[PDB]
UniProtKB/Swiss-Prot annotation:
Localization per Swiss-Prot or TrEMBL: Nucleus
Organism: Homo sapiens
Entire protein: shown range: 700 to 1040 of 1040
Expression induction or repression: During mitosis. The mRNA encoding this protein contains an internal ribosome entry site (IRES) in its 5'-UTR. This 5'-UTR generally suppresses translation while specifically promoting expression during mitosis, when cap-dependent translation may be impaired.
Superkingdom of origin: Eukaryota
Subunit structure: Binds constitutively to TP53BP1. Binds CDC27, which is itself a component of the anaphase promoting complex (APC). Binds PIAS1.
Protein name: DNA cross-link repair 1A protein
Described purpose of this protein according to its UniProt entry: May be required for DNA interstrand cross-link repair. Also required for checkpoint mediated cell cycle arrest in early prophase in response to mitotic spindle poisons. Possesses beta-lactamase activity, catalyzing the hydrolysis of penicillin G and nitrocefin. Exhibits no activity towards other beta-lactam antibiotic classes including cephalosporins (cefotaxime) and carbapenems (imipenem).
Coiled coil: none
Tissues expressing this chain: Expressed in brain, heart, kidney, liver, pancreas, placenta and skeletal muscle.
Protein family according to the UniProt entry: Belongs to the DNA repair metallo-beta-lactamase (DRMBL) family.
Length: 341
């Protein structure tokens, strides 16, 4: 059965609620983004209206085979009426096609559901600036002050320079990048661009990337592995065993692998600056773990909430333990007292 924090009161609506069968009273099912914990349940047999972005719609249709008659794409930054209620979709600065949803309830209440987001000061000049928000359903993934990490821009700079240096010293090195879902595409795109190569990958991954409306994509990616010196592999294969094995397959073209594992936060963030990061190395293989986050840091989250000044906050992440819930409510009360709302 569907938990309370995925229901929108006073509407027939749910958010990211596909794993509970037919939800009683639900006339429209919203999907914030194409990540498996959120779409869990959807398939070609689904027969209720799905509301989402254009990109999320391309993924539903081509990867999960949802029939076209049930996919309702909405443009961003545009007031839309759905089953008699005004809604707006806002870019969430998460993965491609990820949105936040503003609902304008018939009784005058205004609700913002962030889905998964990486809060940015540029959100303070969207359609959020115009008006008041009574309830916030918040992505609280990293709602604790230990969670620090650099900007996405600093992380990409480190990856581009690392890769360019290696391959310039050794033109026979191959670069490999791990992936398990959409998001974080800039890692492998930025590296391929500095090296003047396409990104090589499996047919299934190429399919997924073709659904994302990335400009000039046919110029950037390929299924011909042999022509490419940046390859993508599943994240599970980014280890000394998996990579030795991949190197065997390349037919005596390369004599070194440099690989990148984009992760979220890891404890080595509590001591080490991005500039000071070093790989794990076995022979002619080196692996860099790099902290490329598509979720708010603690400071980014705090700044957004202090700016928005919501009357009530409902977390959507880390809700399963008493200690987590208690920790989150303490931070929300500090933020409110410090800022005066
Ligand atoms: Ni996500």
């Amino acid at each position: 059965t569907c938990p309370f924090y995925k229901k929108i009161p006073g509407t027939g609506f749910t958010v990211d609620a596909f794993q509970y069968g037919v939800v009683e009273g639900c006339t429209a099912y919203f999907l914030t983004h194409f990540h498996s914990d959120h779409y869990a349940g959807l398939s070609k047999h689904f027969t209720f209206p799905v509301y989402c972005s254009e990109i999320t719609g391309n993924l539903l249709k081509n990867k999960l085979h949802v029939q076209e008659q049930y996919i309702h794409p909405l443009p961003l930054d545009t007031e839309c009426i759905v089953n008699g209620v005004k809604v707006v979709l806002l870019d969430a600065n998460h993965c491609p096609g990820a949105v936040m949803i503003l609902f304008y309830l018939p009784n005058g209440t205004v609700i913002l559901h962030t889905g998964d987001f990486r809060a940015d000061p540029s959100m303070e000049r969207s359609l959020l600036a115009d008006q008041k928000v009574h309830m916030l359903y918040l992505d609280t993934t990293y709602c604790s002050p230990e969670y620090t990490f650099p900007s996405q821009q600093e992380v990409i700079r480190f990856a581009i320079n690392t890769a360019f240096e290696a391959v310039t010293l050794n033109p026979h090195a191959l670069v490999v990048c791990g992936t398990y879902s959409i998001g974080k595409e800039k890692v492998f795109l930025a590296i391929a661009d500095v090296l003047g190569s396409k990104v090589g990958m499996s047919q299934e991954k190429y399919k997924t990337l073709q659904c994302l409306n990335i400009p000039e994509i046919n110029s950037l990616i390929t299924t011909d592995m042999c022509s490419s010196l940046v390859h993508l592999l599943p994240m599970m294969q980014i280890n000394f065993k998996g990579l030795q094995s991949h190197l065997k397959k390349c037919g005596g073209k390369y004599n070194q692998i440099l690989a990148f594992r984009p992760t979220g936060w890891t404890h080595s963030n509590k001591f080490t600056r991005i500039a000071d990061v070093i790989p794990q190395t076995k022979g002619n293989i080196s692996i860099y773990g790099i902290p490329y986050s598509e979720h708010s840091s603690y400071l980014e989250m705090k700044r957004f909430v202090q700016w928005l000044k919501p009357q009530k906050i409902i977390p959507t992440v880390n809700v399963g333990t008493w200690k987590s819930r208690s920790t989150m409510e303490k931070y929300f009360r500090e933020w409110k007292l410090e800022a005066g709302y």
